[PDB]
Amino acid sequence: MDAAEVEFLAEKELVTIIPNFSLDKIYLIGGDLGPFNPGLPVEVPLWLAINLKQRQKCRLLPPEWMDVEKLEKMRDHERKEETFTPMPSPYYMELTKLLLNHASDNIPKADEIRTLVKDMWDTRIAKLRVSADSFVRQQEAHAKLDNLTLMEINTSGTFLTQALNHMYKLRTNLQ
Amino acid sequence: LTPAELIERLEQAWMNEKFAPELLESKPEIVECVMEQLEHMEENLRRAKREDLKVSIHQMEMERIRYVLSSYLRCRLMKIEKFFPHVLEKEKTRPEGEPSSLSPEELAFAREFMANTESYLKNVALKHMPPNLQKVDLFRAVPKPDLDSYVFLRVRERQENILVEPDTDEQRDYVIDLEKGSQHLIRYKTIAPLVASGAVQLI
Amino acid sequence: MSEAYFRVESGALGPEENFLSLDDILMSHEKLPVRTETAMPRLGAFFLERSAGAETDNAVPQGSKLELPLWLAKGLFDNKRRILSVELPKIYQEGWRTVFSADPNVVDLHKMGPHFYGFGSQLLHFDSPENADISQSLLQTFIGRFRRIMDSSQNAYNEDTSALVARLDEMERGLFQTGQKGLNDFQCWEKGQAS
Amino acid sequence: EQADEDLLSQYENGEGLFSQKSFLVLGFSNENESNIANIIKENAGKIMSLLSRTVADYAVVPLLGCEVEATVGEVVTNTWLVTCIDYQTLFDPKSNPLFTPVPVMTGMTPLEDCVISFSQCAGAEKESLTFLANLLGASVQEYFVRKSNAKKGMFASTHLILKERGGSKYEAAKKWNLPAVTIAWLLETARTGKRADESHFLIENS
Amino acid sequence: MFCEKAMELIRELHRAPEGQLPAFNEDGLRQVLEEMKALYEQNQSDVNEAKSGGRSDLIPTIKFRHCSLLRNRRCTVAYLYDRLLRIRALRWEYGSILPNALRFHMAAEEMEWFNNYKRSLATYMRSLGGDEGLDITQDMKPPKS
């Protein structure tokens, strides 16, 4: 599994858009959507929001949590804590990338939001590095990681699993 | 029973196959139901890109589902090909009643792959080798699946009395409990029945 | 997904060699010192520098020190017939094991043996009281080098990593390459180049 | 005691035509693409789309091949197609080397100084052989002559290519001591870019 | 020394850049097979002398040659097997027709194996999904813009 499939799974998260046209509610295999009314908020999957945005048939609304002040406090909380903190959503990185790349005209201070999200990502990768180092150095067999996101696990899991396989082989070769 | 649950199960099997180090149990009903849903949806689509802004989205959902399906099937084929001799030997000795990890088509595929590779090895070198070096045991020459590989998992249903064995020193063995929703890292072999039963999800 | 092609993984660190692994074969082609316990007739033509004169049917004399490939020693090593005795290579003796216990990051593993870990693990098939110490030294070295491997793999874009990568074992090089591949994929995705 | 005995024992001496079939067409000009699609439809075949969600029974490509990005049942050439239509038979693609792309080393003209005439070849097969001969640099003349004739613009032939013993040109080549060789010689020369040894491929040795 | 040509074959195949198919080295294979035949004949003669002449002191030496035979066998199989994987990768990278330059490096038996592989894969894909089949080799990347 590559990062592109993780973003593909991220594209399922629901977001709120402002349609500028009318259309009867659609019955997708994944769920009902609509009805649509100009100027009325509607909840649709992120990929659909992006598609409509490219078609310039709606206005994208930024998530309530996507706020420079809130994101800055979340980053400071993650930095002050030694363990991983609960993330607002399981696909924050993909939603930030897609929204800032396709809706910068609707998101104020997109650059600062991108910097805050990149800082949070850096601090979580560093904390995952220190956690893997502690796990390996003590030759542990169990570790809890409820707050880790799919993107990071998929980014470094083949390396971590190969290293653990080698450590298990060396640890059990005396037979 | 609902389409949403069908898609969720499909994604579950896809992820589990991507991260499981061995071939998992076959899920024919899921592939079948998804192919039926796709056939129906494709049938109920017209062809007039003007005011039909609903087909330009239904076909997108269809492509996304087809992508997930194709990826899952490709991963299964890669695993079937990688360890084909051990998979065929395990299927041959599979006790009646336990769920099989191969569909009839996958069995045919594995048989043909084995036969083709054996024929190639025989015609290219074996017949030109000494009489006493023409039989190569494929069950030993081919690496076996590594069931002692670590994996990441997501707890779907709380589980208790799980025995963790750090090493060969039984004195270091201890019990742990898995709480619903938690995420863990552990050797696949230790939690294999929980993946098979569907109580846990490979991250 | 990943590339359709994957090298056959090494089984050298397990109980038995992997029959089809190219790295295992390359490891098994390295020569190690042995001592002959019985005379071997008709082999002098292959061990010319050990051909005692020329009237003993090119026999290999008893007590001759030879360099034989690992696979051949493993095939002939029988505890009952005692055809040959195996001597420990220098890098596995107590002094070098102590150097590894002191600092594993200073040793160029590629220069000393491109299959250091696999060869060391396969050496344990011979009955020796030091097998546990060899296993422990291998494990401690791996643990001692893992952190540096992670640091270099995750920061290779910002630091010249050629000197370290040139010193890595083949399995270690493969692991580094996998980590770098993951990093490259993430970077391409972040810039939108992954598609 | 059993292993030594086994070791010693190891050395002991003692109506519809293309109805249920799918085709892709790739690598052709727009006109030729449309022409091929039209022939396919006239012969009851179905044409599938690029990035099709289903697999195709056959991919139809030019004689020299092209990029075929999609999985298909069997890759065939337009020569195979035309031969099938002429004989109303679905020939096995493996039954003839001209039914699948032939590897050619680009830019090499090893027969540029050679003069070839063909015998026993007709229609699409003869056309494709002439195309390949020209691609390799040889001149192909309808008539088989042993001496150049400025007035008629014909040059003496250097090689006879044929399939079986028999016929006028074969006998003439024997009488005049000219080499008579199988098509495999030409296909191997094209594969290698070097003039193959005629004596290794003589029709008398086939 | 015994098994040098096989070792050269393995080194050549290992050194090839990822995904490139080097030319089939037939000469090395022929030389290895001839060496194996010679060793087999020498061991046969030595076993005959040990049994008829009671020269059991030659039995360990015979085992030496026997071990060498196994080494050659292993190397040969391993070499061919590695090549198969590369051919498989080519099927997934270029499609149903490989570029001519790569095609020129293959032996006839490798071509037959490739054809059988593609045939089985096509049959499997046709067997999936009822009447219409599913091409799973398409959309290798997420349809995301």
CSV table of C-alpha atoms in Angstrom, one decimal, chain D residues 1-189:
chain,number,residue,atom,x,y,z
D,1,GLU,CA,24.2,-46.8,8.2
D,2,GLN,CA,21.4,-46.1,5.8
D,3,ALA,CA,22.8,-42.9,4.4
D,4,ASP,CA,26.1,-44.5,3.3
D,5,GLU,CA,24.2,-47.4,1.7
D,6,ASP,CA,21.8,-45.0,-0.1
D,7,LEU,CA,24.8,-43.0,-1.4
D,8,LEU,CA,26.5,-46.2,-2.7
D,9,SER,CA,23.1,-47.3,-4.2
D,10,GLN,CA,23.0,-43.9,-6.1
D,11,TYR,CA,25.9,-44.9,-8.3
D,12,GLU,CA,25.1,-48.7,-8.8
D,13,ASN,CA,25.3,-49.6,-12.5
D,14,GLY,CA,22.6,-51.8,-14.0
D,15,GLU,CA,-23.9,-17.8,-39.1
D,16,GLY,CA,-21.6,-15.3,-37.5
D,17,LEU,CA,-17.8,-15.0,-37.6
D,18,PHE,CA,-16.5,-12.7,-34.9
D,19,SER,CA,-19.7,-12.8,-32.8
D,20,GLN,CA,-18.5,-13.8,-29.3
D,21,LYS,CA,-15.2,-12.0,-29.5
D,22,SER,CA,-13.8,-8.7,-28.4
D,23,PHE,CA,-11.1,-6.7,-30.2
D,24,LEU,CA,-8.9,-3.7,-29.4
D,25,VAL,CA,-7.4,-1.7,-32.3
D,26,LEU,CA,-4.3,0.3,-31.4
D,27,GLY,CA,-1.4,2.1,-33.2
D,28,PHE,CA,-3.1,2.9,-36.5
D,29,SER,CA,-3.9,6.1,-38.3
D,30,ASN,CA,-7.4,7.5,-37.8
D,31,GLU,CA,-8.4,6.4,-41.3
D,32,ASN,CA,-6.9,2.9,-41.0
D,33,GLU,CA,-8.3,2.6,-37.4
D,34,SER,CA,-11.8,3.4,-38.7
D,35,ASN,CA,-11.3,1.0,-41.7
D,36,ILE,CA,-10.3,-1.8,-39.4
D,37,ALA,CA,-13.2,-1.2,-37.0
D,38,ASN,CA,-15.5,-1.2,-40.1
D,39,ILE,CA,-14.2,-4.6,-41.2
D,40,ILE,CA,-14.6,-5.9,-37.7
D,41,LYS,CA,-18.2,-4.8,-37.5
D,42,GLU,CA,-18.9,-6.2,-41.0
D,43,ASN,CA,-17.6,-9.5,-39.7
D,44,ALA,CA,-19.8,-9.4,-36.5
D,45,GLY,CA,-17.0,-8.3,-34.2
D,46,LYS,CA,-17.4,-5.9,-31.3
D,47,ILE,CA,-15.0,-3.0,-30.7
D,48,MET,CA,-14.1,-2.0,-27.1
D,49,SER,CA,-13.1,1.3,-25.7
D,50,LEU,CA,-9.8,2.6,-24.5
D,51,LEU,CA,-9.6,2.2,-20.7
D,52,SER,CA,-12.3,-0.4,-21.0
D,53,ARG,CA,-13.4,-2.0,-17.7
D,54,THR,CA,-13.5,-5.4,-19.3
D,55,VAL,CA,-10.7,-7.5,-20.9
D,56,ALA,CA,-10.5,-8.1,-24.7
D,57,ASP,CA,-10.3,-11.4,-26.4
D,58,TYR,CA,-7.8,-10.0,-28.9
D,59,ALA,CA,-5.6,-6.9,-29.4
D,60,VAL,CA,-5.1,-6.2,-33.1
D,61,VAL,CA,-1.8,-4.4,-33.8
D,62,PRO,CA,0.4,-3.6,-36.8
D,63,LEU,CA,2.8,-6.2,-38.3
D,64,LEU,CA,5.8,-4.6,-36.4
D,65,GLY,CA,3.8,-4.3,-33.2
D,66,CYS,CA,3.1,-1.3,-31.1
D,67,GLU,CA,2.3,-0.3,-27.5
D,68,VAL,CA,-0.5,-2.5,-26.0
D,69,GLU,CA,-1.3,-1.2,-22.6
D,70,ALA,CA,-4.2,-3.4,-21.7
D,71,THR,CA,-4.5,-7.1,-20.9
D,72,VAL,CA,-6.0,-9.1,-23.8
D,73,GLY,CA,-6.5,-12.8,-24.6
D,74,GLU,CA,-4.2,-13.0,-27.6
D,75,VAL,CA,-2.3,-10.4,-29.5
D,76,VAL,CA,-2.7,-10.7,-33.3
D,77,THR,CA,-1.7,-8.6,-36.3
D,78,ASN,CA,-3.8,-7.2,-39.1
D,79,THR,CA,-2.1,-9.8,-41.3
D,80,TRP,CA,-3.6,-12.5,-39.2
D,81,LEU,CA,-7.0,-10.7,-39.5
D,82,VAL,CA,-6.8,-10.5,-43.3
D,83,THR,CA,-5.6,-14.1,-43.6
D,84,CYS,CA,-8.5,-15.2,-41.3
D,85,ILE,CA,-11.0,-13.3,-43.4
D,86,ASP,CA,-9.7,-14.6,-46.7
D,87,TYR,CA,-9.9,-18.2,-45.5
D,88,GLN,CA,-12.9,-17.7,-43.2
D,89,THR,CA,-11.0,-19.5,-40.5
D,90,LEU,CA,-9.7,-18.4,-37.1
D,91,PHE,CA,-6.1,-19.6,-37.3
D,92,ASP,CA,-4.1,-20.2,-34.2
D,93,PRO,CA,-1.7,-17.2,-33.7
D,94,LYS,CA,1.0,-19.7,-32.8
D,95,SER,CA,0.5,-21.6,-36.1
D,96,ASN,CA,2.4,-19.0,-38.2
D,97,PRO,CA,5.2,-16.6,-37.2
D,98,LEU,CA,3.6,-13.8,-39.3
D,99,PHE,CA,0.5,-13.9,-37.0
D,100,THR,CA,2.3,-12.1,-34.2
D,101,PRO,CA,4.7,-9.2,-34.1
D,102,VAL,CA,8.2,-10.0,-35.5
D,103,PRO,CA,11.1,-8.4,-33.7
D,104,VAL,CA,13.2,-6.2,-36.0
D,105,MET,CA,16.4,-4.4,-35.1
D,106,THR,CA,15.6,-0.8,-36.1
D,107,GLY,CA,17.9,1.0,-38.5
D,108,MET,CA,19.7,-2.0,-39.8
D,109,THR,CA,19.6,-2.8,-43.6
D,110,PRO,CA,21.7,-6.0,-43.9
D,111,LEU,CA,20.2,-7.0,-47.2
D,112,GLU,CA,20.6,-3.6,-48.9
D,113,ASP,CA,22.9,-5.2,-51.5
D,114,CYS,CA,20.6,-8.3,-51.9
D,115,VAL,CA,18.0,-9.0,-54.6
D,116,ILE,CA,15.1,-11.2,-53.5
D,117,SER,CA,12.3,-12.9,-55.4
D,118,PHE,CA,9.5,-14.8,-53.6
D,119,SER,CA,7.7,-18.0,-54.7
D,120,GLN,CA,4.5,-19.6,-53.6
D,121,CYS,CA,3.4,-16.5,-51.6
D,122,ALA,CA,0.2,-14.5,-52.4
D,123,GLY,CA,-2.0,-11.8,-51.0
D,124,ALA,CA,-1.4,-10.4,-47.6
D,125,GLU,CA,1.5,-12.8,-46.9
D,126,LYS,CA,3.4,-11.8,-50.1
D,127,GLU,CA,2.6,-8.1,-49.3
D,128,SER,CA,4.1,-8.4,-45.8
D,129,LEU,CA,7.1,-10.3,-47.0
D,130,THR,CA,7.8,-7.6,-49.6
D,131,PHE,CA,7.3,-4.9,-46.9
D,132,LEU,CA,9.9,-6.6,-44.7
D,133,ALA,CA,12.3,-7.1,-47.6
D,134,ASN,CA,12.1,-3.4,-48.4
D,135,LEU,CA,12.5,-2.5,-44.8
D,136,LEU,CA,15.7,-4.5,-44.7
D,137,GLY,CA,17.0,-2.7,-47.8
D,138,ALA,CA,16.6,-5.3,-50.5
D,139,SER,CA,14.9,-4.8,-53.9
D,140,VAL,CA,12.1,-7.1,-54.7
D,141,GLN,CA,11.4,-7.9,-58.4
D,142,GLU,CA,8.3,-9.6,-59.7
D,143,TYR,CA,10.5,-11.6,-62.1
D,144,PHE,CA,13.3,-14.0,-61.2
D,145,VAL,CA,16.4,-13.4,-63.3
D,146,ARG,CA,20.0,-14.5,-63.1
D,147,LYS,CA,21.5,-11.7,-65.2
D,148,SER,CA,20.7,-7.9,-65.0
D,149,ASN,CA,18.9,-6.3,-68.0
D,150,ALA,CA,19.2,-2.5,-68.2
D,151,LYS,CA,16.5,-2.3,-70.9
D,152,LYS,CA,13.8,-4.0,-68.7
D,153,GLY,CA,15.2,-2.5,-65.5
D,154,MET,CA,15.6,-5.8,-63.8
D,155,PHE,CA,18.6,-6.8,-61.7
D,156,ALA,CA,20.0,-10.3,-61.2
D,157,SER,CA,18.6,-12.0,-58.2
D,158,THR,CA,20.8,-12.9,-55.2
D,159,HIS,CA,18.4,-15.0,-53.1
D,160,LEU,CA,15.3,-17.2,-53.6
D,161,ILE,CA,12.9,-17.5,-50.6
D,162,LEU,CA,10.3,-20.2,-50.6
D,163,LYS,CA,8.6,-22.8,-48.4
D,164,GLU,CA,8.6,-26.2,-50.2
D,165,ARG,CA,10.5,-28.2,-52.7
D,166,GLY,CA,9.2,-27.6,-56.2
D,167,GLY,CA,8.3,-25.0,-58.8
D,168,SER,CA,9.9,-23.1,-61.6
D,169,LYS,CA,12.1,-20.7,-59.5
D,170,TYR,CA,13.3,-23.5,-57.2
D,171,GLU,CA,14.5,-25.6,-60.2
D,172,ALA,CA,16.0,-22.5,-61.9
D,173,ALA,CA,17.9,-21.7,-58.7
D,174,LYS,CA,19.2,-25.2,-58.6
D,175,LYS,CA,20.2,-25.2,-62.2
D,176,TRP,CA,21.9,-21.8,-61.8
D,177,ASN,CA,23.4,-22.7,-58.4
D,178,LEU,CA,21.4,-20.0,-56.6
D,179,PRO,CA,20.5,-20.4,-52.9
D,180,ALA,CA,16.9,-21.4,-52.2
D,181,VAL,CA,16.1,-20.8,-48.5
D,182,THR,CA,13.1,-20.9,-46.2
D,183,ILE,CA,11.3,-17.8,-44.7
D,184,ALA,CA,12.9,-18.7,-41.4
D,185,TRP,CA,16.2,-17.5,-42.8
D,186,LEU,CA,14.7,-14.0,-43.5
D,187,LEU,CA,13.1,-13.9,-40.1
D,188,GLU,CA,16.3,-14.8,-38.3
D,189,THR,CA,18.3,-12.2,-40.4
